[PDB]
Amino acid sequence: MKIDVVTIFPEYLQPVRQSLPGKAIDAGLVDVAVHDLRRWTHDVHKSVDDSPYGGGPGMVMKPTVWGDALDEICTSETLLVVPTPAGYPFTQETAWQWSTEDHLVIACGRYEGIDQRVADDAATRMRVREVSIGDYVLNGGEAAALVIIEAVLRLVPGVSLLEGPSYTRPPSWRGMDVPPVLLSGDHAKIAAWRAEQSRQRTIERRPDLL
Amino acid sequence: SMKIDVVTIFPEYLQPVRQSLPGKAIDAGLVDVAVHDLRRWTHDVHKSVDDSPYGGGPGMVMKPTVWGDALDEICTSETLLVVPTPAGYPFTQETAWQWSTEDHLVIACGRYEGIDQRVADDAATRMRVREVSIGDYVLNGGEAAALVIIEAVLRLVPGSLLEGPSYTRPPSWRGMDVPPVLLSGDHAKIAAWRAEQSRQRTIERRPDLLGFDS
Ligand SMILES: Oc1ccccc1-c1ccno1
Numbered sequence: 001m002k003i004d005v006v007t008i009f010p011e012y013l014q015p016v017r018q019s020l021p022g023k024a025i026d027a028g029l030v031d032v033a034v035h036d037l038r039r040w041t042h043d044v045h046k047s048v049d050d051s052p053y054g055g056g057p058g059m060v061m062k063p064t065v066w067g068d069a070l071d072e073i074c075t076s077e078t079l080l081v082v083p084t085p086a087g088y089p090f091t092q093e094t095a096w097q098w099s100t101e102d103h104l105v106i107a108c109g110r111y112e113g114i115d116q117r118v119a120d121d122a123a124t125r126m127r128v129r130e131v132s133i134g135d136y137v138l139n140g141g142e143a144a145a146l147v148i149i150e151a152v153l154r155l156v157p158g159v160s161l162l163e164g165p166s167y168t169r170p171p172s173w174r175g176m177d178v179p180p181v182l183l184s185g186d187h188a189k190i191a192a193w194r195a196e197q198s199r200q201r202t203i204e205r206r207p208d209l210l
Numbered sequence: 211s212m213k214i215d216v217v218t219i220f221p222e223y224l225q226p227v228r229q230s231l232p233g234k235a236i237d238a239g240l241v242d243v244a245v246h247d248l249r250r251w252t253h254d255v256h257k258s259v260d261d262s263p264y265g266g267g268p269g270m271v272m273k274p275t276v277w278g279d280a281l282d283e284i285c286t287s288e289t290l291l292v293v294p295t296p297a298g299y300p301f302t303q304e305t306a307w308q309w310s311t312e313d314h315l316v317i318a319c320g321r322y323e324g325i326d327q328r329v330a331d332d333a334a335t336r337m338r339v340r341e342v343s344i345g346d347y348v349l350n351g352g353e354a355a356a357l358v359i360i361e362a363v364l365r366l367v368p369g370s371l372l373e374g375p376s377y378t379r380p381p382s383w384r385g386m387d388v389p390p391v392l393l394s395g396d397h398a399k400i401a402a403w404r405a406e407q408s409r410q411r412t413i414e415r416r417p418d419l420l421g422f423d424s
């Protein structure tokens with residue numbers, strides 16, 4: 001798989017690309033490349049955004065700049081991923097789907113957004129996915145890109161209910177004992193205990209899942 | 211001011227918190243972010259932070275001893291201890307607003323399969339603890355979730371409906387025109403078109419926000 005990320009903060013994505021198992025680059029299973037959006041600016045001031053039509057605060061990212069960047073980086077086989085607060089939800093099922101893609105391009109924009117014509121144009125010749133990673137507001141798409149890259153790549157070979165509490169040694173620590181059932185050697189009972197713990201925690205923390 | 215401490219076995223991975231939205235806040239002195247290598251609190255020759263799970267199962271669980279010593283040093287009774295976990299309460303914008311007024315956040319970055327539950331339990335006897343999920347997908351570790359939480363919280367520090375499409379110059383591009391209403395300068399018609407766009411988009415992409423089935 002090849003992942004290209006386009007961003008005005010290239011340094012942001014550098015630790016996740018040097019994260020990968022050398023054995024998976026050398027085997028050609030994966031490659032992550034980060035591109036500075038300012039490579040495709042037209043002016044000496046390297047402008048990437050401009051005032052929104054119709055008024056309002058902030059700035060909107062320029063279609064001419066983004067258009068040139070995606071023209072260079074994308075092909076007809078590309079899945080173009082655009083993080084946005086107004087996106088469809090990114091889920092584990094999404095990550096599974098994208099994990100079998102040959103080429104992901106992630107376009108990182110600011111909160112106010114990329115001119116809509118960029119995605120609209122791109123969608124006439126490639127698959128485009130606008131996605132949100134949760135219901136909170138980030139200043140830009142970079143952190144969302146990190147989350148997406150991590151969730152997708154750990155599903156690439158070689159790279160419900162909530163889970164209940166886990167425990168390891170020592171059996172007693174600061175007055176708290178590991179639940180004795182976990183040391184019982186009754187593995188049917190352990191499974192049933194864990195199921196009840198999951199039920200209780202899901203009720204408490206994520207009743208939406210029920 | 212706000213202090214954020216992050217504890218992790220991958221301190222270099224938290225470097226994206228620099229020269230950025232959080233970087234700007236740091237350099238403006240509105241926040242101090244310190245990153246701590248958890249292995250600093252081991253005494254093992256191999257600096258071991260994990261062990262096999264009691265009761266069975268795949269993978270490893272982070273040892274409570276190391277975490278206990280780390281949090282003993284870093285946290286006070288006033289600390290909000292944040293623990294990213296797939297089994298957490300949802301971290302939302304409301305959460306971000308709430309934490310934006312905290313004096314001290316400590317974020318404990320764990321492995322996916324998790325930190326021994328007694329760490330959070332012990333911490334809760336002397337400080338507030340919040341175990342949170344940032345979304346329904348699986349990360350390998352808490353580090354990316356820490357970066358998301360830091361960014362969401364810091365932009366709110368002093369110092370419904372989906373957003374519809376936005377546009378900027380030029381008014382025609384590749385034969386695609388900006389919707390004429392946006393060029394018209396009529397605040398009322400612009401407000402109405404934008405509301406209608408947001409409605410179509412929320413219904414299509416996030417029907418849950420308006421109280422419909424997914
Ligand atoms: O807040 C954002 C700004 C830009 C791009 C994406 C986001 C976002 C927020 C939540 N998920 O994605």
Ligand SMILES: Oc1ccccc1-c1ccno1
Nearest residue numbers: 294295322343344349351352
């Ligand atoms: O998958 C994870 C692993 C470790 C810590 C946190 C997470 C997580 C996933 C979603 N929200 O948080």
